[PDB]
Design an enzyme around this catalytic site. Structure first.
Site, mmCIF file in Angstrom:
data_model
loop_
_atom_site.group_PDB
_atom_site.id
_atom_site.type_symbol
_atom_site.label_atom_id
_atom_site.label_comp_id
_atom_site.label_asym_id
_atom_site.label_seq_id
_atom_site.Cartn_x
_atom_site.Cartn_y
_atom_site.Cartn_z
ATOM 1 C CG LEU A 199 51.142 26.755 74.481
ATOM 2 C CD1 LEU A 199 51.912 25.719 74.894
ATOM 3 C CD2 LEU A 199 50.085 26.930 75.161
ATOM 4 C CG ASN A 200 56.035 32.148 74.926
ATOM 5 O OD1 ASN A 200 56.079 31.897 76.070
ATOM 6 N ND2 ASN A 200 56.843 31.275 74.091
ATOM 7 C CD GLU A 247 61.726 26.048 75.289
ATOM 8 O OE1 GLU A 247 61.425 25.019 74.336
ATOM 9 O OE2 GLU A 247 62.539 26.271 75.929
ATOM 10 C CG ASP A 248 53.356 27.064 70.383
ATOM 11 O OD1 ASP A 248 53.602 26.665 69.398
ATOM 12 O OD2 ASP A 248 52.234 27.628 70.869
ATOM 13 C CG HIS A 249 56.241 31.590 67.945
ATOM 14 N ND1 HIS A 249 57.529 31.737 69.021
ATOM 15 C CD2 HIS A 249 56.682 31.391 66.843
ATOM 16 C CE1 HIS A 249 58.510 31.603 68.257
ATOM 17 N NE2 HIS A 249 57.972 31.501 67.064
#
Length: 138
Positions: free
Chosen positions: A126-127, A122-124
DNA sequence: CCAGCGGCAGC
DNA sequence: GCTGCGCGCTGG
């Protein structure tokens, strides 16, 4: 397992070989821009190059390094305890350790072990990395 | 000159 | 499922 390098150049890509350093980095990024945090992270790792050293640190010293990043008292105490639990608890995933939540655990499961297909970040950033991985997989 | 902003624990 | 922790940065 070596996580491939990406066009987003997340700092996890250069720290995956040492789970403790990768996780310390995720803590440095809690509500803190990488532009501010990562320079100080190199300073931290110089004064404290391993969990063994950081476990014995005076949290006030750590706090002094963390001051201009904000969240310097909480996180200084978290880093010491986390580094102690990292070596004393027999964890399988670092989310079991104090100071590591889903973001740090998602980072570990994409970069430190070969579990990126089971992860749903859900981290930007990481996504961005994880979406690129599903694309360029083969 | 000013105020919005960049995970995790604990309860 | 809500709050506290917190600075320098940045755009206006």
């Amino acid at each position: 397992w070596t996580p491939p390098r990406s066009p987003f150049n997340l700092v996890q890509e250069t720290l995956f070989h040492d789970p403790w350093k990768l996780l310390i980095a995720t803590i440095f990024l809690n509500r803190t821009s990488g532009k501010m945090a990562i320079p100080v992270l190199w300073k931290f790792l110089e004064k404290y190059p391993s969990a063994e050293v950081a476990r014995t640190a005076d949290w006030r010293d750590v706090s002094e390094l963390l001051k201009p990043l904000g969240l310097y008292d909480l996180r200084a105490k978290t880093i010491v305890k986390f580094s102690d639990e990292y070596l004393t608890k027999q964890w399988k995933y670092p989310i079991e350790l104090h100071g590591i939540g889903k973001y740090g655990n998602d980072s570990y499961r994409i970069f430190c072990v070969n579990e990126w297909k089971q992860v749903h970040p859900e981290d930007h950033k990481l996504n961005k990395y994880h979406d690129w991985l599903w694309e360029n997989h083969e």
